[PDB]
C-alpha cells in the first residue's frame, strides 16, 4: 500500500498503488484506494482496508449532510476535520490512514494528512507501507510550483519506485487530478509504469 497526494496550483493529484495483500499472498491486485467523499474530495485509504472503508463512508455521510445543509460544496478543511475526528475518536480501534485531498472555492487545492488522528496541511503527503521507501526520491525531486503534468508524472514515478521495492505494493497506479473543472480519473497499467534501475 502506497498512496500519495500532491498539491499544485489548480488542484491536486492522488496517486495510489492497486494491490491489497493478505500476508504473503495478495487478495486483490486491482483496488481503487481513492474513494470520493464528495464531488471533489477524495480520500486515499490505507492500513486496515475495512476500517479505512468504514471511515470513508461515515465521513462521506456527514460531509453530505453538512454539504446540503449549507447549500455549498464543503471545504476540504471541513472534510479533514470530520475524518480527523473519526480517526482520532477510535484510534485504538482503527489502523486507518486517510490522506484526504480535494478542492474548494475558498482555498483551492489542499492535501491534509490525517495519520493517527492529526491534521496537517502539506505539499505532498505520502503514506502507506511503501511510503517508507520513497522519502528519498520525493525529497530529491520535489520542487514547489509544479505544473499538473509534472505532478502526475512525478507521483507516477514515486509510486513506481515504491512498487519496485515494496512487497506490500504492486499492480497499477491510479491517478486523479482534482480541479475546478472536475475529477480526471486515470489508470496506469503495469506495462506503462516508468521503468527505473531494475537491478
Amino acid at each position: 500500500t502506497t498512496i500519495m497526494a500532491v498539491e499544485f496550483d489548480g488542484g491536486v493529484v492522488m496517486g495510489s498503488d492497486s494491490r491489497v495483500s493478505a500476508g504473503e499472498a495478495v487478495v486483490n491486485r486491482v483496488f481503487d484506494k481513492l474513494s470520493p467523499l464528495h464531488e471533489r474530495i477524495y480520500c486515499a485509504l490505507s492500513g486496515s482496508a475495512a476500517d479505512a472503508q468504514a471511515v470513508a463512508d461515515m465521513a462521506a455521510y456527514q460531509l453530505e449532510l453538512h454539504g446540503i445543509e449549507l447549500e455549498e460544496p464543503p471545504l476540504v478543511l471541513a472534510a479533514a476535520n470530520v475524518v480527523r475526528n473519526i480517526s482520532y475518536k477510535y484510534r485504538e480501534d482503527l489502523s486507518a490512514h486517510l490522506m484526504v485531498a480535494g478542492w474548494d472555492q475558498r482555498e483551492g487545492g489542499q492535501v491534509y494528512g490525517t495519520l493517527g488522528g492529526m491534521l496537517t496541511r502539506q505539499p505532498f503527503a505520502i503514506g502507506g507501507s511503501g511510503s517508507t521507501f520513497i522519502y528519498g526520491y520525493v525529497d530529491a525531486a520535489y520542487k514547489p510550483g509544479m505544473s499538473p503534468e509534472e505532478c502526475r508524472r512525478f507521483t507516477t514515478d514515486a509510486i513506481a519506485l515504491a512498487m519496485s521495492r515494496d512487497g506490500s505494493s504492486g499492480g497499477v497506479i491510479y491517478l486523479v487530478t482534482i480541479t475546478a473543472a472536475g475529477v480526471d480519473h486515470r489508470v496506469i497499467l503495469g506495462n506503462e509504469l516508468p521503468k527505473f534501475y531494475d537491478e
Binding site: 491489497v20 475495512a50 468504514a54
Partner: protein, 219 residues
C-alpha cells in the same frame, strides 16, 4: 470450503464445494453454500459456517422487507452495504467471508466482503481455504466478456482445483448462473469423486444385539 465467483457478458456465476469439516473429519457431504438473498442476488458462504448462515439470512430478511418497501428490485450495492456494516459492527469476530453476487439494472456485480468489513468489487474471486487453487486457475484463464458456457466450465475448473488440491473442501461443486432474466441453481454441477459403492455387506441378523431393557409405546 472453497467458493469462487466469476463475471461474464450477461451475468455472474458462483461456485461452491459441498463439504464441511469438523476439525479433522468431513462432517457433511452435501452442504449447500450458494444461499439466497434476493430473487436474483445470491450470496456464497465461506469461513465460519454458522456465521455465514446467520449473517446472510438476516441480510436476506432486510432485503426482502426492503424489496417490498421500495416496490423495486434490490440492488446488490444495498446487500453489500448492509452486510459490511453488520460485519463491521462486530469487529471481525463473525468470521463470515461472504462473496455476494447479483444482477442489477447497472449490470452484473460480484462483490467480495471479508470478515472485518472490507468489500471490494472485482470481476473474479475465490474465498475459502481453496482460494489458492481457485485464484490460480481463475487468474490463468479469465477473460472479460466470456460465454456463459466457457464461464461454467471455467468456474468448474476452478472449484474443481480447490476440490482436488485442498483438504477441507470436497464433495461436489455447485455453480449458480445468474443473468438479467433470472437465477438458475445448477445444483451439483460436477461430481469428480465416484466412490459411492462398496463390496462388503455388513449385516447382523436380528438377535445379535444383546438387549437388556425394553418398552414400546403405541401412538
Amino acid at each position: 470450503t472453497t467458493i469462487a465467483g466469476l463475471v461474464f457478458q450477461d451475468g455472474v456465476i458462483l461456485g461452491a464445494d459441498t463439504r464441511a469439516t469438523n476439525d479433522s473429519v468431513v462432517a457433511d457431504k452435501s452442504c449447500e453454500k450458494i444461499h439466497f438473498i434476493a430473487p436474483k442476488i445470491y450470496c456464497c458462504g465461506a469461513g465460519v459456517a454458522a456465521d455465514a448462515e446467520m449473517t446472510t439470512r438476516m441480510v436476506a430478511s432486510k432485503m426482502e422487507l426492503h424489496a417490498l418497501s421500495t416496490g423495486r428490485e434490490p440492488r446488490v450495492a444495498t446487500v453489500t452495504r448492509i452486510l459490511r456494516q453488520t460485519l463491521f459492527r462486530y469487529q471481525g469476530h463473525v468470521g463470515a467471508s461472504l462473496i455476494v453476487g447479483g444482477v442489477d439494472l447497472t449490470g452484473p456485480q460480484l462483490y467480495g466482503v471479508h470478515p472485518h468489513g472490507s468489500y471490494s468489487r472485482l470481476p473474479f474471486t475465490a474465498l475459502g481455504s481453496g482460494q489458492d487453487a481457485a485464484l490460480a486457475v481463475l487468474e490463468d484463464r479469465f477473460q472479460p466478456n466470456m460465454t456463459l458456457e466457457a464461464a461454467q466450465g471455467l468456474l468448474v475448473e476452478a472449484v474443481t482445483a480447490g476440490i482436488l488440491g485442498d483438504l477441507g473442501s470436497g464433495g461436489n461443486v455447485d455453480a449458480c448462473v445468474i443473468t438479467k432474466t433470472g437465477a438458475k441453481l445448477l445444483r451439483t454441477l460436477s461430481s469428480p469423486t465416484e466412490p459411492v459403492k462398496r463390496s462388503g455387506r455388513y449385516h447382523f441378523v436380528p438377535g445379535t444385539t444383546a438387549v437388556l431393557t425394553q418398552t414400546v409405546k403405541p401412538l
